[PDB]
Design a protein around this nucleic acid. Structure first.
Ligand SMILES: Nc1nc2c(ncn2[C@@H]2O[C@H](COP(=O)(O)OP(=O)(O)OP(=O)(O)O)[C@@H](O)[C@H]2O)c(=O)[nH]1
Length: 1073
RNA sequence: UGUGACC
């Protein structure tokens, strides 16, 4: 409940020259008392009278009613920031050392010196691209500095470490003034011409870093990074994190977790000696020297101190630095420079070709329907992203322009222009438009925005490849329902004194031109073999068109902007934008390592315990018939790099016996770590989400970092959410939503009142509001209706339906209509009509919560029903599992030490239900978990129709609608649907073993019937309540259930009429991965 | 309609 209090201290801090608390109640009488109170407050304020008396008079409203929002009548002129900042600007400003960066524009020169004229200006190289101002970030940091002004002991030492760092930011800013943003949170030329180009973005990164400072070590790290980053905008992060790839090979393993035959973590008390050849030490020194040469002093010393003993117990500091390096910001270069960097492959191509065959051999031989109707599959999978060119489009009676793929496909069909039989060229005549990928620390990479003929031609085939990977272990990122803990356990498994692990970053090879030939060629060579495996006209064409995308790309040309011009240059490298990007890259990276290992075997004899490809890295674990020595490592290592060298691949290749470090994860001293470097106050690019959506994403980002090891003060995050979620009524009237409004599980939820704990309404007022917010969840869009009525549109839907099903549609047809009406959301005009409506609705809602005919059931109600039938009692769970993920907070780690962890994802889509598999054997359709949910609950006769309507043959449609399997699917679907509504795969929960024997102990559930659905939810509701109590209290409880039998039948019914909820919080989770 | 692929 502390959010609602912190909110006022904030407004009372920002504004000084009124606040009007607005309450509400599910109880009639009390509500009028709220209504009255509101009035009297406005009136008294409109007379400069003290509200102190009303607060006493309506003491009842302050005590029993629920705080809905807070009115903020502030009369100034968005200044204050200017004023407030001086106090902290006493230090000497920083002076950009314009000699640190290669490309001239990467140096913090004065904006003007980079863009002499307003027409040459572009924020494209510094745009924070976030819907929150620098002005407000500042305000937020001072608000906090004030609140913790009179702190003591250690808390003060945190303030003191921060007070300093913030001076640097303040001093340096004051020297130029505070950059003012516009309605779109953009920094324009007039305001930027004076100040250093990178002023704003650097401010954002520095503030975000200083606010995540606690220990003296944080302070030392923030300080350095904040100072060097004001001048270095291109190698800092790579410099500060490069060492980490060597450090993991130093720490000794004294007990670690491994993967067993049941694919689950299991403790192994073993010892593995870290064996490091001297040469490695030179490499690490050159890296430490390089850091030094760039100004770095403190950070290098820290790694140097740690290097005396190299204890996994003091390693935490090394990982802290590794995660901090990223908070410097994104390296945003110019499209041109980004694109500018770009006989013994016989073995390498042969592998790509064979691997491509293995994945489609069966599918092709058996005339897989997916492959036959590949084109139709491509259409249903189509997104609403860019096609490349902004086309003029006529809908109904409106001529509008769009670049959207979903739009171009419709318009093109309605004019005989739709022709997926012909795969457009991407050469000099039709140059590929470009997109960009920005990341912190690494160089910018370009992206192909190919025409839709390319997606359709690849979609089906790629999906068959991803399936082969799903059950192939070499493909770490696609195998089973596995999470990262499984990959962690696979490495540590064979680690012993007679084996060495070999990790390798191959990100530079994928972009190499030396690669583009063996690649495309290898695939094409495979597609040919596959074609000689069938005679199916459908299969050969879908397979042929795929061959065409590879040939058109062999010699592609690109449209690289160079100011305000678009130069067309011949691109001879494999960029990414295809449907096969990830799959193909995985196939390639794997073929590569297989080639290297095979070559080096001619010298040394080893055993291949495991080979793995995961993203832009690949690794292996080798076993020798003798004990490994520092000299054996050196020899293997040299021969490996040498092998990679003869292939002209600039890659990082290290060899150790204890750890590995790759982009997604790194294993030091038998433990697992995940870089905690998601930026907070700077984004890669601008999307179309709202501020509210961004508030939730910030919090979501806060959570993941926090779990990963980088914690940013929760009071700062909360402050940011107050700013971003506010809504202006006028110029002097700003509305701030209450904790109840922002944390309740509704369509407007932004974060959990308590970290790692998702609450659900357990009071009438909470329920009251919960139902209200839903009343206005989806808003209308005139523009969207118009186009949803246009011929070109209805014909598209209709044409898609007539190709898919045979008998009648409706359930499915109503789906295809909407799925298409939604894709029109990427189209800004529609996106804007929506928001505007949401704001007005939300404006009148936080002013007098409307009514609602409810009649809709949500997971909240189900739980609110159950709650009353459980008896709690103090219990005890000893800690038994050793920590394998060191950075986890303490309250989250405790849970795992008691109940354990898991290495899988709980099926939450229903893809494992027989019906879903049935519909897959005969249809290209893909029903969602929510559609399966409604379908499976229909009358037997109706299900039989749905199946046959989608192409499922009667013998099968009938053999199912009765069988034991059907009755089963019913349970498994609901089970999958519920795990989905509870976010059992996100946040903290994704870590916990919900089937832990230890946890099951604390749940006592006497069966008073035997009706699966009810038994399921009662157990889950208990497991969640028990875990939440532990997350918040550090102790355990036992839950006893005495749920009536007469009640179980009522519940069972509610269960099948649950409604899913959509919200920023919900969408934030999906946005994660 | 300051917008920029696969997922
Ligand atoms: N910062 C600030 N703004 C005020 C104050 N009083 C009124 N405002 C209004 O808030 C605006 C301040 O500039 P903005 O950039 O829009 O700041 P904001 O809209 O309040 O919040 P952000 O967009 O996150 O910065 C002005 O347009 C004023 O109309 C005040 O005391 N401080």
């Amino acid at each position: 409940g502390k959010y609602n209090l912190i909110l006022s201290e904030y407004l009372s801090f920002i504004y000084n020259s009124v606040q009007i608390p607005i309450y509400y109640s599910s109880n009639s009488e009390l509500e009028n008392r709220c209504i009255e109170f509101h009035s009297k407050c406005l009136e008294n304020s409109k007379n400069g009278l003290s509200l102190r008396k009303l607060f006493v008079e309506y003491n009842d409203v302050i005590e029993n009613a629920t705080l809905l929002s807070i009115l903020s009548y502030s009369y100034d002129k968005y200044n204050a920031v200017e004023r407030k900042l001086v106090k902290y600007a006493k230090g000497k400003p920083l002076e950009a050392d314009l000699t640190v960066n290669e490309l001239d524009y990467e140096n913090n020169k004065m904006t003007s010196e980079l863009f002499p004229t307003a027409e040459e200006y572009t924020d494209s190289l510094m745009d924070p691209a976030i819907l929150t101002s620098l002005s407000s970030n500042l305000n937020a940091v001072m608000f906090w500095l004030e609140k913790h002004e009179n702190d003591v002991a250690e808390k003060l030492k945190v303030y003191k470490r921060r007070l300093d760092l913030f001076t640097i930011v303040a001093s340096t800013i004051n020297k130029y003034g505070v950059p003012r943003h516009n309605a779109k949170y953009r920094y324009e030329y007039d305001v930027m011409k004076d100040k250093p180009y990178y002023l704003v973005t650097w401010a954002n990164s520095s503030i975000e870093m200083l606010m995540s400072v606690f220990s003296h070590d944080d302070y030392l790290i923030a300080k350095e990074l904040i100072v060097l980053s004001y001048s270095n905008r291109s190698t800092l992060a790579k410099l500060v994190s490069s060492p980490m790839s060597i450090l993991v090979a130093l720490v000794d393993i004294n007990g670690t977790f491994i993967t067993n035959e049941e694919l689950e973590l299991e403790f192994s008390n073993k010892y593995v000696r870290a064996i490091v050849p001297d040469q490695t030490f030179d490499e690490l020194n050159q890296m430490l020297d390089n850091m030094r040469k760039a100004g770095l002093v403190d950070i290098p010393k820290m790694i140097q101190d740690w290097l005396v003993d190299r204890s996994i117990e003091k390693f935490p500091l090394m990982a802290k630095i590794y995660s901090w390096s990223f908070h410097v910001g994104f390296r945003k270069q110019k499209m041109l420079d980004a694109a500018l960097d770009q006989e013994m492959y016989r073995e390498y191509t042969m592998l790509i070709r064979d691997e491509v065959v293995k994945m489609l051999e069966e599918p092709v031989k058996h005339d897989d329907h997916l492959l036959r109707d590949s084109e139709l599959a491509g259409l249903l999978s189509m997104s609403s992203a860019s096609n490349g060119e902004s086309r003029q489009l006529k809908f109904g009676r409106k001529t509008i322009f769009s670049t959207k793929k979903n739009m171009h496909v419709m318009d093109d069909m309605a004019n005989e222009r739709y022709t997926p039989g012909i795969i457009p060229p991407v050469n000099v005549d039709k140059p590929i438009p470009l997109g960009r990928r920005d990341v912190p620390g690494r160089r910018t990479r370009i992206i192909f925005i190919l025409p839709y003929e390319y997606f359709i031609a690849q979609h089906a085939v790629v999906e068959k490849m991803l399936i082969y990977a799903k059950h192939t272990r070499e493909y770490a990122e696609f195998y089973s329902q596995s999470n990262q803990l499984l990959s962690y356990g696979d490495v540590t498994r064979f680690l012993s004194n007679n084996t060495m692990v070999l990790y390798t970053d191959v990100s530079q090879w994928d972009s190499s031109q030396h690669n583009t030939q063996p690649f495309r060629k290898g695939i094409i060579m495979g597609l040919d073999i596959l074609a000689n495996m069938t005679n199916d006209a459908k299969v050969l064409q879908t397979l042929n068109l795929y061959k065409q995308t590879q040939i058109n790309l062999m010699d592609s040309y690109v449209q690289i902007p160079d100011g305000n011009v678009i130069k067309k240059i011949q691109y001879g490298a494999v960029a990414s934008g295809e449907k096969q990007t990830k799959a193909a890259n995985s196939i390639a990276n794997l073929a590569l390592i297989k080639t290297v290992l095979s070559r080096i075997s001619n010298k040394h004899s080893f055993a291949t315990k495991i080979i793995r490809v995961d993203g832009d890295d690949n690794y292996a674990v080798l076993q020798f018939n003798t004990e490994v020595t520092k000299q054996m490592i050196q020899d293997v290592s040299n021969d490996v790099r040498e092998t990679y060298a003869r292939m002209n691949a600039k890659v990082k290749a290290l060899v150790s016996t204890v750890g590995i470090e790759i982009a997604k994860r790194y294993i030091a001293g038998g433990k697992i770590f995940f870089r905690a470097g998601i930026n907070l106050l700077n984004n890669e690019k601008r999307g179309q989400s709202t501020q509210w959506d961004q508030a939730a994403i910030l919090y979501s980002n806060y959570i993941v970092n926090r779990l990963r090891g980088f914690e940013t003060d929760r009071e700062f995050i909360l402050t940011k959410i107050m700013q971003m979620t506010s809504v202006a009524i006028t110029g002097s009237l700003r509305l701030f939503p209450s904790e109840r409004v922002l944390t309740t599980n509704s369509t407007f939820k932004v974060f959990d009142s308590e970290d790692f704990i998702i609450e659900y309404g357990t009071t009438v007022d909470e329920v009251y509001i919960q139902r209200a917010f839903m009343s206005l969840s989806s808003q209308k869009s005139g523009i969207a209706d118009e186009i949803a009525a246009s011929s070109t549109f209805k014909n598209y839907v209709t044409r898609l339906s007539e190709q898919l099903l045979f008998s009648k549609n409706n359930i499915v047809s109503r789906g295809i209509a909407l799925t298409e009406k939604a894709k029109l959301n990427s189209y800004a005009p529609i996106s804007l009509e929506k928001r505007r409506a949401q704001i007005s609705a939300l404006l009148t809602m936080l002013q007098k919560p409307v009514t609602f005919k409810s009649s809709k059931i949500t997971i909240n109600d189900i739980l609110r029903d159950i709650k009353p039938f459980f008896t709690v009692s103090d219990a005890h769970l000893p800690i038994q599992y050793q920590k394998f993920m060191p950075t986890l907070p303490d309250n989250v780690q405790y849970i795992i030490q008691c109940i354990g962890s898991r290495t899988y994802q709980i099926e939450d889509d229903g893809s494992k239900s027989a019906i879903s598999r049935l519909i897959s054997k005969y249809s290209v359709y893909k029903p969602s978990i929510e559609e399966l949910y409604k379908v499976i609950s229909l009358h037997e006769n109706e299900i039989q129709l749905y199946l046959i309507s989608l192409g499922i043959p009667k013998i099968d449609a009938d053999t199912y609608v009765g069988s034991k399997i059907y009755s089963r699917d019913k349970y498994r679907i609901l089970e999958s649907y519920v795990y989905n509504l509870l976010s059992i795969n996100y946040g903290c929960y994704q870590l916990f073993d919900f089937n832990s024997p230890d946890l099951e102990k604390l749940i006592r559930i006497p069966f008073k019937g035997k009706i699966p659905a009810v038994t399921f939810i009662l157990h889950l509701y208990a497991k969640l309540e028990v875990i939440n109590y532990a997350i918040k209290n550090g102790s355990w409880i036992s839950l006893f259930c005495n749920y009536p039998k007469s009640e179980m039948i009522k519940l069972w019914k509610k269960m099948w009429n649950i409604t899913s909820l959509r919200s920023p919080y919900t969408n934030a989770n999906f946005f994660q991965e």
